Design an enzyme around this catalytic site. Sequence first.
Site, mmCIF file in Angstrom:
data_model
loop_
_atom_site.group_PDB
_atom_site.id
_atom_site.type_symbol
_atom_site.label_atom_id
_atom_site.label_comp_id
_atom_site.label_asym_id
_atom_site.label_seq_id
_atom_site.Cartn_x
_atom_site.Cartn_y
_atom_site.Cartn_z
ATOM 1 N N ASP A 1 0.877 -1.288 0.172
ATOM 2 C CA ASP A 1 -0.142 -0.129 0.056
ATOM 3 C C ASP A 1 0.870 1.270 0.043
ATOM 4 O OD1 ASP A 1 -2.320 -1.682 0.651
ATOM 5 O OD2 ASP A 1 -1.598 -1.898 2.669
ATOM 6 N N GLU B 1 -11.535 -0.126 -1.552
ATOM 7 C CA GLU B 1 -10.532 0.305 -0.804
ATOM 8 C C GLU B 1 -9.600 1.103 -1.145
ATOM 9 O OE1 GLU B 1 -9.085 -2.521 1.868
ATOM 10 O OE2 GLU B 1 -7.847 -3.522 0.148
#
Length: 449
Positions: free
Chosen positions: A11, A202
């Site tokens: 991420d 997300e």
Amino acid sequence: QPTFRWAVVHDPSIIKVGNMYYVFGTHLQVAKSKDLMHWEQINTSAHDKNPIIPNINEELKETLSWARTRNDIWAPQVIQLSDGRYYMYYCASTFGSPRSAIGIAVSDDIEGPYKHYAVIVKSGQVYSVDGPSEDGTPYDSRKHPNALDPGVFYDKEGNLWMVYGSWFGGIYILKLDPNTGLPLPGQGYGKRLVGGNHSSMEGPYILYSPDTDYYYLFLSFGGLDYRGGYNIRVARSKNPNGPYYDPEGKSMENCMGSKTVISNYGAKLVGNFILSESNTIDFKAFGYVSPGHNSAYYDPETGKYFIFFHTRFPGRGETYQLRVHQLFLNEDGWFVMAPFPYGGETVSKLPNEEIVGEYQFINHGKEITDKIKQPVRIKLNSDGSITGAVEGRWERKEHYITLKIIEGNTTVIYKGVLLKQWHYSEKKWVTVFTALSNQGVSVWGIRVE
Ligand SMILES: [Ca+2]
């Protein structure tokens, strides 16, 4: 002759400080590169003794307390604010739990140490004990977001915004006070942009493009795991706070439901694939499984755009690595992703000789699926025909390519870019294309040379 050394950053959020690019990610994974190719690993976990946040358990006791975890923070983004200091927006949570918080930590130096600044968003309030949600009503994980995954950005007018969310009540945007980096009062969770009702999405990130004067919202649809079908989706708006529209003209405000339904929306940039002609697991072949949770960067010194994401690899299970690809703008002002990692390539008009030929063709489709797509063989011929695996017509103006590809009963137009890139597994310069249709489908072609 490009060489590479990647880092393990999950991420990854990009920030340029000086002549150095830095990615921050989950578990406090941090690395930096001058060249976008050779990465130096700077931190790997949020252990008591890490240098980015030492004694994080005590330093961020407020968020970790809230989220009942320790020795972890997910999804950090560092941004430099107008006072000169570095502000790391992060979240803390537990797996698939709506019990989370977005916090901020702060440092005068890019590499830390960061200290506690604010907790700005919380979710999973248990009314009897914690009272209500951020909007003054009982928390309910269908309609309120999960406080995770902050994406912070300035708009071309110098206002400051955080986009955030993961599954649960969707993806929300809050306006922030640029002098303090805290949410302005009485917006609650903000304005919903996408999702709701446990939609599988997300990792929101909004990049502003001075070249199209649009904001692009990037998301990750699906499961991050080896079998989750993680894929990267794009939408865009004239406005930082939307509404966001996909290339068909659907509104992202309407994007919510089962995986089957939300797959309909957005431009799917990439998903699972392998450039092997023999099988779906071939370690000599270039391929990714569940690429996503990205960020993005516009380099104003060169005019190039990059995407920063993590990926797993066919047959390699959960193991992941940082990847960096160049993104290009097509004729209609949508992003298409370079097939291979960034190798110093800079688009340019190619003559026919370099365009005509046999290609490996990957059509990434529109689904959230764990299937590892494999190429077919097409031909771009000198008379403008496409033959082989598909039938149709191609043409180009400058670096911009249009393919008109027969698909059943209909003609599907894909619009993209043509360029020379470094073949990551084959270690040589090849022609490639990357194009996108109005229904949000991406095709990559790699010439066989
Ligand atoms: Ca984030």
